[PDB]
Each structure stands twice: as C-alpha cells, then as structure tokens.
C-alpha cells in the first residue's frame, strides 16, 4: 500500500501482481463533484487488468461543504503497465478537456 496522492500524479509505480496500491485524492461531493473512471463509474475499466474498491471520507462535522478525501484501493491482477485514469467531474455533466485528471501507472512483472 503506497499512499499515492496528487503530488504523485503521473508516476509509474512498480508493484507485484496481487499488491494493493492506495490512492488518496481530495474530493468535495457536496459541490456535485467526485472522482470517476472514464464514463462516470468507480469500477475498474478492465477487471482482468486491475480491480478497484473505493471509499469517501467526509469530515465528520457540521462544517457543511468542507472537502474530504476519496480512497481508491487498486489491486493489480496481471503483468504489464496499467494506467489508472481518474477524472474529477459532476457525473451528470460529463468531463471536458479542462477537467482535473489524475493518473498513475502500475507496472507489474
């Protein structure tokens, strides 16, 4: 588990097949936004390449609209270099070319 954050956008991590990689990104879904894979899902684009679980961590308080953090737990399933491409968007809107993106590449032998 690596604790990959925005500071690590664009990195290639060397990982073992089976290893869990933990991504944490800032997120504020009370503004309507959250992180999705292409097409507005939190599911892996390709389960045979890697699996993903996700959980959002809200501030536990009455500070309404404070941002929290989304955790994605990615397990690599096969050898190769696998792109994890997330986009920060309102899911009814779609993304645009200005949308904030996060990508990391997971390399397994």
């Amino acid at each position: 588990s690596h604790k990959v954050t925005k500071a690590h956008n664009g990195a290639t991590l060397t990982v073992a097949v089976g290893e869990l990689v933990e991504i944490q990104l800032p997120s504020n879904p009370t503004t309507g936004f959250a992180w999705y894979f292409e097409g507005g899902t939190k599911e892996s684009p390709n389960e045979s390449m890697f699996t993903v679980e996700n959980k959002y961590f809200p501030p536990d308080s009455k500070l309404l609209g404070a941002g929290g953090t989304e955790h994605f737990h990615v397990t690599v399933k096969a050898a190769g270099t696998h792109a994890v491409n997330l986009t920060y968007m309102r899911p009814w809107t779609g993304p645009s070319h200005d949308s904030e993106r996060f990508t990391v590449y997971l390399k397994a032998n």
């Binding site: 800032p26 997120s27 504020n28 879904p29 009370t30 503004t31 309507g32 936004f33 959250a34 959980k55 959002y56 809200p58 501030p59 009455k62 500070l63 309404l64 609209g65 404070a66 941002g67 929290g68 920060y88 309102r90 899911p91 009814w92 809107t93 779609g94 645009s96 200005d98 904030e100």
Partner: protein, 258 residues
C-alpha cells in the same frame, strides 16, 4: 383555522417573486451553506413586501464577509450562523456568475457542461474570494445603502407540521441533510436513500411539499445549477426525518425595506 393543504408550492403561492423559481450554482466552492441562506432570504423579502421588493441577495457577500462566525468560506460553513449575520450586518444584492445583477454578483463560475472555453474552468481547489465592500461598476446604490437586514433568525423544530406551518406562513426555509452517493444521479420523483456511501451534510432550500404516487415529499432547491436533477429542484421523502432533512431547519423574518 390551522388547516394545512395537502400540497403547497411557494412558486405558486407567490407567483410574482421570481427568485423563488431561481436555481443558482455554487460552482466548485463548498458554499451551499451560504446559498441555502441567501436563496430563502431573497424569497422571504419578496414575500414580506407582497412583491414590491424582489432582489437576489448576494451569496458572494455572505461567503466572503461573514468570517469566523460562519465557518470557512469555500471550505464549508454553518447555516444558522449565516442567518444571524444577516440580522447583524445585513447582505447586499448580487446575482449569478457574470450576470451584472446587483451589488456583488457571484464570482465563481458555474459547472454545468460547457464547450469551447469562453469561461474560466471549475477546479477542485479554489480560494474563498476577499471581502470587498464595494459594488460592481455600473451598479448605482453604494454598498452600505444596498444592505438588506433580518429582524430575527431561529431554528424550526424537528417536526413535519412545524416546518410546513413555517413555510406556509413565512416562506421558504434553509435546511440540511445527509448526502449519499445515489443522490448525485437523482433525476425525478421522490428521492429516498437506498444505496451509496455517505458524502457529508449539505445545505439546501425547502420551498413546499406534496404527495407523488402516494409518497409525501418536500420540494427542495439544490445549488448545482438547472442541469442537475429536476431542473435544479428535487423532491425528498417527508415525515420520517429522512436523511435528517427535518432536523436542522433555520429561518428568519426580514426587516421591512420596501
């Protein structure tokens, strides 16, 4: 002598108060706490004056000038405290992004689908703008002269009948409820939480009630633009403090400007 109707829609009871119908967009700022307030305050000023005064009260003013009492600007805030600020310092007018309406129109761009880039983009990370006590160029009344004040502010009890009474007599209120992920993709009918993770508390404007297909509901405006949900509004189950929708209702009566 206290017979509440089965349904009530503030837009119909007060049809010459356009703000009641108006959906705003907070953009990528955690300012719903401020929007719920200024939206219901706008509505109540118009109601209070039988439509002689119809003004869009500035989210920007509240977001930027309230400070500690209200929380942390674009990084979240407190509804009750917003209404207390209106009673103490008042709020100027200000419309939608790039509207040139009022003293201090909202300075943060909307985030509905947009193409070919004739607008600054929506970003996860945004500053709270500064408290500038000056009106936009072209807007005539000075900042101080444009202030609208509250007579009072108060909590409404966690009681369906008390909230209905409050809306029926005095106009739309601000409330708050727990957002779950299934709420994001709401399109129509009565929202009930049935799946998805907790996403935190969210402030909104409650402007009426009714029954749809046998399901009692609250009529609620969101601040995620008109493209979201049912043209910016939604209905949410009423009578069971669903998602806490009945538990944190606040309001206040305006001081007469006319």
């Amino acid at each position: 002598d206290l017979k509440l109707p089965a349904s009530f829609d503030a837009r119909e009871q007060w049809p010459q108060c356009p703000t009641i119908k108006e959906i705003r967009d907070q953009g990528s700022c955690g300012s719903a706490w401020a929007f719920g307030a200024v939206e219901a305050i706008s509505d109540r000023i118009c109601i209070h004056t039988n439509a002689h005064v119809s003004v869009e009260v500035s989210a920007e003013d509240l977001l930027t000038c309230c400070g500690s009492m209200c929380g942390d600007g674009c990084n979240g805030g407190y509804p009750a405290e917003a209404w207390n600020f209106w009673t103490r310092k008042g709020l100027v007018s200000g419309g939608l992004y790039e509207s040139h309406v009022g003293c201090r129109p909202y300075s943060i761009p909307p985030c509905e689908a947009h193409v070919n880039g004739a607008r600054p983009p929506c970003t996860g990370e945004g500053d709270t703008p500064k408290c500038s006590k000056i009106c936009e160029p072209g807007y005539s009344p000075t900042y101080k002269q444009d202030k609208h004040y509250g007579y009072n502010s108060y909590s409404v009890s966690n009681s369906e009948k008390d909230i209905m009474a409050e809306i029926y007599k005095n106009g739309p209120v601000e409330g708050a409820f727990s957002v779950y992920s299934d709420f994001l993709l709401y399109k129509s009918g009565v929202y009930q939480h049935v799946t998805g993770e907790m996403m935190g508390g969210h402030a909104i404007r409650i402007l009426g009630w009714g029954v749809e297909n046998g399901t009692p509901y609250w009529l609620v405006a969101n601040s995620w633009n008109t493209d979201w949900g049912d043209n910016g509004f939604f209905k949410i189950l009423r009578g069971q403090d669903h998602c806490g929708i009945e538990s944190e209702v606040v309001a206040g009566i305006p001081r007469t400007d006319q």
